[PDB]
Each structure stands twice: as C-alpha cells, then as structure tokens.
Amino acid sequence: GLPRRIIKETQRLLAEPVPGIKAEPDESNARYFHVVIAGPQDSPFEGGTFKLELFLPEEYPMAAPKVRFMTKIYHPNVDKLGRICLDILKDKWSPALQIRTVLLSIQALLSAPNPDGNDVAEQWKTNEAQAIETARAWTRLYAMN
Amino acid sequence: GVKVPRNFRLLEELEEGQKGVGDGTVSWGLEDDEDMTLTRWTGMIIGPPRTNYENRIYSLKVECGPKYPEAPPSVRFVTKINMNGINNSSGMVDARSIPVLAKWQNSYSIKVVLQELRRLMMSKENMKLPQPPEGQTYNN
Numbered sequence: 132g133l134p135r136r137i138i139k140e141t142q143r144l145l146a147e148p149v150p151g152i153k154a155e156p157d158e159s160n161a162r163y164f165h166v167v168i169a170g171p172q173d174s175p176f177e178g179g180t181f182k183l184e185l186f187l188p189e190e191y192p193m194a195a196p197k198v199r200f201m202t203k204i205y206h207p208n209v210d211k212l213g214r215i216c217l218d219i220l221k222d223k224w225s226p227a228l229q230i231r232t233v234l235l236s237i238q239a240l241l242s243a244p245n246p247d248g249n250d251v252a253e254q255w256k257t258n259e260a261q262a263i264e265t266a267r268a269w270t271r272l273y274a275m276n
Numbered sequence: 277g278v279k280v281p282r283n284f285r286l287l288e289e290l291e292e293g294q295k296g297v298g299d300g301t302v303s304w305g306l307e308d309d310e311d312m313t314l315t316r317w318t319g320m321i322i323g324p325p326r327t328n329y330e331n332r333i334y335s336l337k338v339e340c341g342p343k344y345p346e347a348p349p350s351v352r353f354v355t356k357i358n359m360n361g362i363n364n365s366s367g368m369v370d371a372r373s374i375p376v377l378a379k380w381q382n383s384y385s386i387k388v389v390l391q392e393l394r395r396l397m398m399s400k401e402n403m404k405l406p407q408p409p410e411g412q413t414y415n416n
Contacts, residue, residue, distance in 0.1 A: 163279075
C-alpha cells in the first residue's frame with residue numbers, strides 16, 4: 132500500500148536534504164512529513180523558522196500533496212490557518228513534480244510574495260512597505276522559538 | 277490502509293462544516309478563526325420534532341485534542357438542556373453515556389458526534405424530559 136516512489140522520495144530527502152529546509156517523515160505515518168523552512172535572506176522572514184506539515188494523499192502522485200504552515204506568518208499567500216495559495220497545489224499540479232519541488236516552491240514563495248481576495252494581500256498592494264515591516268514583526272514574534 | 281493525520285483530518289471537517297451536510301439539523305465550525313491548531317469547535321443542534329427539545333437551538337463546545345481522531349473529542353453544551361449524560365450544572369457530556377463517545381472509532385467525526393446527540397434527544401428517556409426555559413447557558 133506504499134508506492135515505491137514515496138519510499139524513494141523519502142530516502143532522497145533524508146540523504147540529500149534541501150538547503151534551509153528540514154523535512155522528515157512521521158514516526159507513525161509514512162505519508163506525513165514534518166517540515167521546517169528557514170526564512171530566506173533578504174526577505175522580511177529572514178532569521179525566522181517556519182513549521183510546515185505535508186501529507187501525501189492516496190492518489191499521489193496524481194493528486195498534489197497537501198501542505199500547510201503551522202507557524203503564524205504574515206504573507207499574501209498564506210491565510211490565518213496556514214493554508215497556502217500556490218498554483219502547483221491545485222490546478223497546476225503535475226506528477227512530474229516532487230515533494231522536493233513543492234518545498235522549494237514554498238521557500239521561493241517566501242522570497243517573492245504574490246499579492247495577486249485577502250486582507251493581508253490587500254495590505255501588500257495598497258501599502259507594501261508597511262506590509263513588509265509587519266511581516267518582519269510577525270517573524271520576530273512567532274517564528275523565533 | 278491510508279491514515280489522514282489529525283490536522284489534515286480537521287481541515288477536511290472544517291471544509292465539510294462550511295459546505296454542510298443533510299438537512300442542516302446539525303452544524304459545526306471553528307471557534308476561533310485564527311486557531312491554527314484546529315482544537316476548539318462550535319457545535320449546533322436543532323432539537324428534533326415531536327420531543328420537548330423541538331424548535332430549540334443548542335450550542336455546544338467541542339474540543340478535539342492532540343490524539344483526535346484516534347481519541348474522541350470533549351463535548352459540552354453551552355445552551356442549557358435536561359438530557360441523560362449531560363451534567364446538570366456544567367453541561368459537560370459524560371462520554372460513558374454516549375455510545376459514539378464510549379465506543380469511539382477513528383472513522384467518527386464532529387458531525388457524527390453531533391448527529392448522535394441529536395438522535396439521543398429522540399430516545400424514550402430524553403424526549404419527554406421537562407426542559408429549562410430557553411435562553412439559559414451554563415457558566416465558564
């Protein structure tokens with residue numbers, strides 16, 4: 132009941148970890164991954180550490196993995212419950228993409244916010260300088276311990 | 277078998293809460309919309325017809341802990357109710373008296389818990405109980 136591909140991806144993640152991203156499978160569930168993404172340099176999230184969790188549904192890799200932040204973060208594409216607006220997690224998902232690809236994309240997403248509804252996203256548009264400084268404040272407050 | 281972890285299960289139930297099920301006689305949603313832990317839920321039951329609960333709306337607090345759904349949730353009524361298994365002064369639901377809670381399966385959910393309580397409102401021992409006036413709530 133466990134696809135060979137998943138066993139391979141898991142083993143590749145543990146042996147070839149992505150820089151700045153820690154990602155390990157759960158002790159009780161091989162489809163469940165605990166993720167820690169370091170805030171990218173030159174972004175307002177720098178210095179912070181962000182907890183995510185990833186899950187591979189039965190129909191992976193036909194369906195996308197499900198990913199969610201567990202660290203409170205002020206970002207245009209992340210809502211109050213940590214849910215991530217990212218195209219490859221829905222309409223633009225293709226089986227040629229890996230778990231590794233997802234985490235890199237999320238990591239990229241932190242360096243390049245995508246304002247283009249949402250209250251935070253509106254703030255990033257109408258007042259980007261203010262929004263950035265709020266993201267930095269939230270990094271200090273909720274992403275350092 | 278493929279297990280869905282707590283948090284991703286709770287997101288599924290969050291979504292099912294918004295879409296709603298059946299005739300809408302029970303409903304549920306997150307208590308605090310910023311609660312990333314998805315722990316505290318607001319539950320609602322419409323009193324079944326042809327009982328002393330009929331035409332009454334009951335609000336409930338449901339707490340899904342760190343082991344949910346492998347372990348059952350905590351349930352308490354906020355709206356006052358006379359009903360077997362519900363503590364008269366606190367409104368806490370005594371798990372031992374609610375079969376869904378005492379014989380919990382991980383296939384169950386907040387929905388199942390609410391539908392179970394509403395079913396039990398139709399039982400012989402509950403349906404004829406004289407009820408408090410509406411508009412009363414427990415403390416805390």
